[PDB]
Design a protein around this ligand. Structure first.
Ligand SMILES: *[C@@H]1O[C@H](CO)[C@@H](O[C@@H]2O[C@H](CO)[C@@H](O[C@H]3O[C@H](CO)[C@@H](O)[C@H](O)[C@@H]3O)[C@H](O)[C@H]2NC(C)=O)[C@H](O)[C@H]1NC(C)=O
Ligand SMILES: *[C@@H]1O[C@H](CO)[C@@H](O[C@@H]2O[C@H](CO)[C@@H](O)[C@H](O)[C@H]2NC(C)=O)[C@H](O)[C@H]1NC(C)=O
Lengths: 319, 219, 215
């Protein structure tokens, strides 16, 4: 289900996509896949929208049995991009498309890579071939009001506001990863260990975290703990049936203790209920997720920007 | 063990037919508590019909139902009953049984545990599959399907074989005076898709083993 | 000589707020008053007996008060499962077990005007010998709406039926269909078929119409 807003029923492909300043306003655009729509328009000159009727909850995932997608409040890379936390960059010819997903008919797909996040788009009237390598014309996409299953998010991924770590901690994490995967040479074309002879690039499923430096920390043995911290971004503010509150309304609810709220919002930021002369006022409620994830790895505890399990392309040592 | 009242299943009868529905009590001393029956006509409130004390089969009826129904009990099988000699169309309703809890000499008791209810449908019609008619269109537009003259409930309605679910309203069936049901299912669509998108409503009536796919087109 | 009057018939209230429902007996029933809850699609269940005693396993946010003729059911902070119908019941005087007519507790939202559409009968239905004209009111709030059929300006009664959805899970609105049914012969002796809709969200009534056999 959605964080705030049920799936869009757009009426035309030409409607503009406004920039919205409020957090809950942004969340509602995310619920409606307006951010992926905006990405496609910027980068592929796509016309219109993805997510018609279905919204974010009906996106396709690889693998399809996807743990974090069950929690509407966990952010995907595209979600985090819209919130300014990272950038899903337009794919270049050198970015490798992983085998496994069902690419045929897709209009957008995205995967984490070793050093970032990459998206592949299609222009108006086109969709992806079975291999994902090319866009071909597809009469099923002519309306420009496309369903959510045309959007493919690769990986079991959760993004979250990060607690930055110093370079010294990154370099010790990085050395621990190297010691855990001594046979890997490159990942997604990025040197991981020094090698001479190497395999061809191969699909590689791995746990990883993005800790905000030059590349991800990939992990074999690691521990995670989820704790609900009830920070201000863990709540959204809306009115029943009518969508997100404005930026200034949201700021009032999350600073003054004077708005309606669910129990956890009352418990943390304060709430006031009843009475009113007329019209329902703003309410804030807890976003549905396990909380904030802390990763134990190599003797360190880190609150990463993103954490996930997903497929990348790796070469292996040959000797 | 907790108190449970389990009623018999839904009934479909013709006018002037007889009908006996049942309510089986478990988890308590059956002979020692009144059992009541409560009628709920479609879209209306609750009306008390009568009570029976299974210990000695003493009965009390509301004046509204006295002489119209008979309430009985069989304590050998912990079951209470409600029955009609000759049903009318206006007996279509949900019927609940409920156990009466008495506390003292001042009042008459309240209903502390309820059965799940028995739907009774009275129509002179026999099993019949629906006719499906387009609601032709007509920013956004509305289109739909009129699913008319079927019996009994239920029909199921989907759009584009289930690919289209958001923005659909399938209204509750109405039991017409002909004894047949009718409903409409409508959906909101972009006007610009009228003529480029195909909209088909799939209507399935299991009691008549009928499936109908109806394409809904402009003009 | 014994009525139970519940007010209001529909209580529109926001999640987390306190709700107060009242029951007035036309004559004293002491404390012998019970409250029942009926959730959508479910059987009623006891909430309160003896005017103020909460039944076993009922959440603590439900309380009842009163004695004599004026009774209250209070829900201290409404949860999503509390939007339901509530019935009061008298068990003091014969004929006992008088039920109130019910108070529906529904989700409050800003007024939303219906989008109104009219649908003429299909050729396929006309060739079956009957004609159904459908008027659709989509996604409005509150529930109260007036739909009147005019057949060349003559107001119709007795040949129409309405059907309404439940309050929608996501946007908390209602939708409504009104179906006018005529014989084919009756359909064909009139020209103008019109649906006229009155609703709080509309500054003035809205009429949707067509002419038999023209577009
Ligand atoms: C598709 O292109 C859009 C145009 O570049 C881009 O929108 C731009 O997004 C940025 C980042 O969110 C906004 O940046 C600034 O907005 C306000 C001022 O209005 C500042 O207070 C913020 O701090 C922020 O710096 C731009 O306003 C916005 N521009 C427009 C014209 O909308 C989209 O982000 C692109 N889509 C994707 C998926 O990247
Ligand atoms: C495409 O759809 C949008 C959204 O409905 C239209 O924008 C609305 O237009 C109506 C008038 O037709 C205005 O009253 C609304 O205020 C507009 N809403 C917004 C959010 O802008 C848009 O006009 C449509 N485009 C075309 C070409 O019809």
């Amino acid at each position: 289900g959605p964080i705030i807003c049920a799936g869009p029923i757009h009426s035309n492909k030409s409607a503009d996509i406004p920039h919205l300043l409020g957090y809950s306003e942004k969340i509602c655009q995310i619920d409606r896949l307006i951010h992926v729509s905006s990405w496609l328009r910027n980068h592929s000159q796509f016309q219109g929208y993805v997510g018609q009727r279905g919204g974010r909850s009906q996106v396709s995932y690889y693998p399809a049995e996807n743990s974090y997608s069950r929690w509407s409040g966990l952010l995907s890379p595209c979600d985090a991009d819209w919130l300014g936390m990272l950038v899903v960059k337009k794919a270049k010819g050198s970015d490798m498309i992983v085998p496994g997903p069902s690419y045929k008919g897709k209009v957008f797909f995205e995967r984490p890579t070793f050093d970032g996040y990459v998206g592949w788009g299609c222009g108006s009237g086109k969709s992806r071939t079975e291999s994902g390598e090319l866009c071909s014309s597809d009469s099923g996409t002519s309306s420009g009001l496309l369903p959510s299953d045309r959007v493919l998010w690769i990986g079991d991924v959760a993004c979250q506001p990060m607690t930055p770590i110093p370079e010294e901690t990154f370099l010790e994490l990085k050395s621990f990863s190297q010691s855990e995967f001594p046979d890997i040479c490159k990942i997604d074309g990025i040197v991981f260990n020094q090698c001479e002879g190497e395999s061809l690039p191969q699909p590689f499923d791995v746990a990883w975290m993005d800790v905000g430096h030059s590349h991800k920390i990939i992990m074999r043995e690691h521990k995670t703990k989820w704790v609900q911290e009830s920070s201000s971004k863990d709540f959204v503010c809306y009115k029943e049936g009518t969508g997100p509150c404005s930026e200034s309304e949201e700021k009032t609810c999350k600073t003054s203790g004077s708005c309606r709220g669910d129990m956890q919002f009352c418990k943390v930021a304060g709430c006031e209920h009843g009475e009113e002369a007329s019209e329902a006022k703003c309410r804030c409620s807890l976003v549905h997720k396990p909380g904030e994830v802390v990763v134990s790895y190599g003797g360190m505890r880190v609150r990463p920007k993103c954490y996930g399990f997903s497929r990348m392309m790796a070469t292996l040592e040959v000797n | 063990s907790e108190v449970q009242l389990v009623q018999s299943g839904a009934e479909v009868k013709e006018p002037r037919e007889s009908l006996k529905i049942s309510c089986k009590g478990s988890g308590y001393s059956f002979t020692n508590y009144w059992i009541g029956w409560v009628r709920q006509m479609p879209g209306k409130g609750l009306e008390w019909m009568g009570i029976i004390f299974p210990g000695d089969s003493d009965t009390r009826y509301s004046p509204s139902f006295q002489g119209q129904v008979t309430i009985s009990a069989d304590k050998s099988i912990n079951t209470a009953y409600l029955q009609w000699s000759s049903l009318k169309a206006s007996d279509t309703a949900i019927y609940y049984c409920a156990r009466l809890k008495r506390r003292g000499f001042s009042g008459e008791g309240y209903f502390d545990y309820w059965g799940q209810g028995t739907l009774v449908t009275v129509s002179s019609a026999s099993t019949k599959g629906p006719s499906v008619f387009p609601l032709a269109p007509s920013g956004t537009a509305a289109l739909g399907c009129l699913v008319k003259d079927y019996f009994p409930e239920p029909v199921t309605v989907s759009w584009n074989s289930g690919a289209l679910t958001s923005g659909v309203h399938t209204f509750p069936a109405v039991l017409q005076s002909s004894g047949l049901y009718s409903l409409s299912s409508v959906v909101t669509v972009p006007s610009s898709s009228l003529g480029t998108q195909t909209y088909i409503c799939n209507v399935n009536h299991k009691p008549s083993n009928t499936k109908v796919d109806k394409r809904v087109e402009p003009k | 000589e014994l009525t139970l009057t519940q007010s209001p018939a529909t209580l529109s209230v926001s999640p987390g707020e306190r709700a107060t429902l009242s029951c007035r007996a036309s004559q004293s029933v002491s404390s012998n008053l019970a409250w029942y809850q009926q959730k959508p699609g479910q059987a009623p269940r006891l909430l309160i007996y003896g005017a103020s005693t909460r039944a076993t396993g009922i959440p603590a946010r439900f309380s009842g008060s009163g004695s004599g003729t004026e009774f209250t059911l209070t829900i201290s902070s409404l949860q999503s499962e509390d939007f339901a119908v509530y019935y009061c019941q008298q068990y003091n005087n014969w004929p006992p077990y008088t039920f109130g007519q019910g108070t529906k507790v529904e989700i409050k939202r800003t007024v939303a005007a219906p989008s109104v559409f009219i649908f003429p009968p299909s050729d396929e239905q006309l060739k079956s010998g009957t004609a159904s004209v459908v008027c659709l009111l989509n996604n409005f709030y509150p529930r109260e709406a007036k739909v009147q059929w005019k057949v060349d300006n003559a107001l119709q009664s007795g040949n129409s039926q309405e059907s309404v959805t439940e309050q929608d899970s996501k946007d908390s609105t209602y939708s409504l269909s009104s179906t006018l049914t005529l014989s084919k012969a009756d359909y064909e002796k009139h020209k103008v078929y019109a649906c006229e809709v009155t609703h709080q969200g509309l500054s003035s009534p809205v009429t949707k119409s067509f002419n038999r056999g023209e577009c």
